[PDB]
Amino acid sequence: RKQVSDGVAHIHASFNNTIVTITDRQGNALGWATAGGSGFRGSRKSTPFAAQVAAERCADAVKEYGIKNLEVMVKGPGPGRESTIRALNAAGFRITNITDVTPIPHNGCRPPKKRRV
Amino acid sequence: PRRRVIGQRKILPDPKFGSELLAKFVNILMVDGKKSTAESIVYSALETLAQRSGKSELEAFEVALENVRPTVEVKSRRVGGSTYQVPVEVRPVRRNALAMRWIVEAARKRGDKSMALRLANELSDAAENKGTAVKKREDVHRMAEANKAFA
Amino acid sequence: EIDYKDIATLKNYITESGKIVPSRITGTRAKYQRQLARAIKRARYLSLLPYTDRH
Amino acid sequence: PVIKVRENEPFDVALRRFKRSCEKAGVLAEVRRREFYEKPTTERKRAKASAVKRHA
RNA sequence: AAGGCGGCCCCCUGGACGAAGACUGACGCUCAGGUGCGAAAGCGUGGGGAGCAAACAGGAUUAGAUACCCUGGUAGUCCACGCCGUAAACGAUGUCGACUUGGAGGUUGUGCCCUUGAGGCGUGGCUUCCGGAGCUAACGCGUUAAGUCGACCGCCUGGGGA
Ligand SMILES: [Mg+2]
Ligand SMILES: [Mg+2]
Ligand SMILES: [Mg+2]
Ligand SMILES: [Mg+2]
Ligand SMILES: [Mg+2]
Ligand SMILES: [Mg+2]
Ligand SMILES: [Mg+2]
Ligand SMILES: [Mg+2]
C-alpha cells in the first residue's frame, strides 16, 4: 500500500519456535510470519527449515509496501538463528547490518529449576 | 565395508554398440539371471524409441538420462537421538547408476502391453521431463533443498 | 598510576561489546587487572565509558 | 555483536563474520548458562573441576 | 575464628602482613565450668513481594504415578527487630610451639642491581600441584605432615537398639 524501502528485519529465535517480524526503522510493524503458523508442529516447529519458510512467507506479505534494503536484528538462540537470514537475502533483499540483540542480564532474575530428565 | 576399502567391478561393454553404460542398464533390467531375455527388451525399446523420436540411438538415451540424473541427495544420520537429513552431492559414476534405476522401476509400474513398450514410452517421458522417472529426481531435489542448513 | 579519567588507555581493555578483558588475554599483572576493573566500572558510572554495545 | 555489511563484500562472508563475532562474545554460551538456576555449591563444584582439567 | 563474604561510592570499624628502630620485661600456651558467634529451613510482630517455589489445583506419562515433565501457584525466599542453635557446620584432620632433602607455579610485602615502554639477585606473609626420607592397613600424607618431639583440651571402646 504505502512506501518504506528501508526497514528492519526482527527475529525472535527461541528453542521452541521462531517469530519473523518485518518492521520499519522506527519500530512499527509492517508484517509478520512464524514457524508454528507456517503449518508445522512440535519437532518440525523448532527446525531451521521451518525458520527458512517463515522468512519466505514474511517477505511475501510485506513486499506490498515495497522494501529493497533491510538491517537484520537477531534475538535469542536455537535453530533459525542463521537459516532465517539466508532465506531473507536469497528472497530479494540487501542486508545492511546484522545485529545480535539476545537479552543478557547482569545477574538479576532467578531462572526456573533445572529439568530432571 | 568398515576396514575393507574395495574398488568396483568393471563389467564387459555391450555386445551391440560397445558402451559399458548400457551393459549396466541391461543388468538393471535383467531379472532371475536371464541376460538373453533382458538385452532383448532393452534393444527393442531402443529401436522403437529412436524410430519415433528421430534416430540417434546413442543420444536419444542421453536426452532421457540428463533429466532423471540427480545432483544432490540426503543421508539419514542419528546425531542426538533424532534423525537429521544431511545433503550430500552424488558422485559422477553413482549419478547415472540411480538415473538408470528410476527408468527401469517407473516403466515396471506402467500398464502397457509389453516391457519393450513400457521402457520405450518411459525413455520418451523422461526426454520431455514429464513422468514418474523425472518426479523421483524432483522429490529428491525438494528434500535436499529443505535440509540445506545441515550441509 | 591507573585512573578512570584516562579513557584512552581504558578503551584498550574492553571488548567490542564493552565487557572487561581477562588477565589471560591482556597479559596484565594480577594487582592491576583489579585496579583496571575498579576504574573501568568508575568511568562506566560517569558515562565516560559505555556498559553495552547497544547504547 | 553489531556487524555492518561492507561495499562489494558478500552476504556469505558478512554472515560468517557475524557468527564469529557471536562466538567471540559468548551469545549462545551465556544463554545455555542462564537457562536454569545453578546453586552456589553447584557452580563452586564446576569452578573446582575446571581447574583440575586445566592441568596438562 | 567458623559460619561465611562479590556492582559502584561515602561514613564508622575489626583483623592480617612488611620495613626500621625504640619501649615493656615471661606479661606465655591451653582450657572442664562459663560466655559470645553460628548456612539453610523453621517460628513471632510489622512491612515488602518482580522472579523462583514447599503445600495445593489443573494438564500428561504410567499397569498404577499421591513423583520425575508441563500450566498455574500459597507459605517462604527480601527488610526491621526478637527467637531457634542445628548441616556431609568437612581438610570428615583440636589449639600452640620446636625440628627434618627437593621441583614447578599463584598471590601479597620489602632490600638491592640495570638505563627499564621489563627483567637480574635476595629476603618475609599466605596459597596450589608433584614429590624425598619417614609414616600409613592400604588409599594416600609429605616443612600448610597423616614425619620427628613436647603442652593442654575434646573424644572412642563390636553391630542393630539409639
Ligand atoms: Mg629494662
Ligand atoms: Mg517470617
Ligand atoms: Mg513445578
Ligand atoms: Mg507461618
Ligand atoms: Mg551434630
Ligand atoms: Mg604429595
Ligand atoms: Mg613413597
Ligand atoms: Mg552396641
UniProtKB/Swiss-Prot annotation, chain A:
Gene Ontology molecular function terms on file: small ribosomal subunit rRNA binding; structural constituent of ribosome
GO-annotated biological processes: cytoplasmic translation; translation
One GO CC term, this protein: cytosolic small ribosomal subunit
SUPFAM superfamilies xrefs: Translational machinery components (SSF53137)
Keywords for this protein: Methylation, Ribonucleoprotein, Ribosomal protein, RNA-binding, rRNA-binding
Pfam family, one: Ribosomal_S11
Task performed by this protein: Located on the platform of the 30S subunit, it bridges several disparate RNA helices of the 16S rRNA. Forms part of the Shine-Dalgarno cleft in the 70S ribosome.
Other information: Has been predicted to contact the N-terminal domain of IF-3 based on footprint studies; exactly how IF-3 interacts with the 30S subunit is controversial.
Subunit structure: Part of the 30S ribosomal subunit. Interacts with proteins uS7 and bS18. Cross-links to IF-3. In stalled ribosomes contacts ribosome rescue factor SmrB.
Family statement: Belongs to the universal ribosomal protein uS11 family.
Name of the protein: Small ribosomal subunit protein uS11
Lineage summary: Bacteria, Pseudomonadati, Pseudomonadota, Gammaproteobacteria, Enterobacterales
Curated annotation (Swiss-Prot), chain B:
GO cellular component, as recorded: cytoplasm; cytosol; cytosolic small ribosomal subunit; membrane; ribosome
GO biological process, one term: cytoplasmic translation
Keywords of this entry: Ribonucleoprotein, Ribosomal protein, RNA-binding, rRNA-binding, tRNA-binding
Keyword field contains Ion transport: no
Domain of life the protein comes from: Bacteria
GO MF terms, alphabetically ordered: mRNA binding; rRNA binding; structural constituent of ribosome; tRNA binding
Similarity field: Belongs to the universal ribosomal protein uS7 family.
Quaternary structure and interacting proteins, as annotated: Part of the 30S ribosomal subunit. Contacts proteins S9 and S11. Cross-links to IF3 and the P and E site tRNAs.
Stated role: One of the primary rRNA binding proteins, it binds directly to 16S rRNA where it nucleates assembly of the head domain of the 30S subunit. Is located at the subunit interface close to the decoding center, where it has been shown to contact mRNA. Has been shown to contact tRNA in both the P and E sites; it probably blocks exit of the E site tRNA. Protein S7 is also a translational repressor protein; it regulates the expression of the str operon members to different degrees by binding to its mRNA.
Name this polypeptide is given: Small ribosomal subunit protein uS7
Entire protein: shown range: 2 to 152 of 179
UniProtKB/Swiss-Prot annotation, chain C:
This protein's UniProt keywords: Acetylation, Ribonucleoprotein, Ribosomal protein, RNA-binding, rRNA-binding
Gene Ontology terms, MF aspect: mRNA 5'-UTR binding; small ribosomal subunit rRNA binding; structural constituent of ribosome
Disulfide bond positions: none
GO cellular component term of the entry, any: cytosolic small ribosomal subunit
GO biological process: cytoplasmic translation; translation
Subunit structure: Part of the 30S ribosomal subunit. Forms a tight heterodimer with protein bS6.
Job of this protein: Binds as a heterodimer with protein bS6 to the central domain of the 16S rRNA, where it helps stabilize the platform of the 30S subunit.
Family (UniProt): Belongs to the bacterial ribosomal protein bS18 family.
Name of the protein in question: Small ribosomal subunit protein bS18
Source organism phylogeny: Bacteria, Pseudomonadati, Pseudomonadota, Gammaproteobacteria, Enterobacterales
Gene: rpsR
Shown residues in whole-protein numbering: 20 to 74 of 75
UniProtKB/Swiss-Prot annotation, chain D:
Biased composition regions of type Basic residues, renumbered to the chain: 45-56
Protein name (Swiss-Prot/TrEMBL): Small ribosomal subunit protein bS21
Summary of subunit composition and partner proteins: Part of the 30S ribosomal subunit. In stalled ribosomes contacts ribosome rescue factor SmrB.
Domain of life: Bacteria
Ribonucleoprotein in keyword set: yes
Family membership noted in the UniProt record: Belongs to the bacterial ribosomal protein bS21 family.
Keyword Lipid biosynthesis listed: no
Role according to the record: Probbly involved in recognition of ribosome rescue factor SmrB in stalled/collided disomes; fusion of protein fragments to its N-terminus decreases ribosome rescue in the presence of SmrB.
GO CC annotation: cytoplasm; cytosol; cytosolic small ribosomal subunit
Any GO BP: ribosomal small subunit assembly
Keyword field: Ribonucleoprotein, Ribosomal protein, RNA-binding, rRNA-binding
S-S bridge residues: none
Gene Ontology molecular function, alphabetical: rRNA binding; structural constituent of ribosome
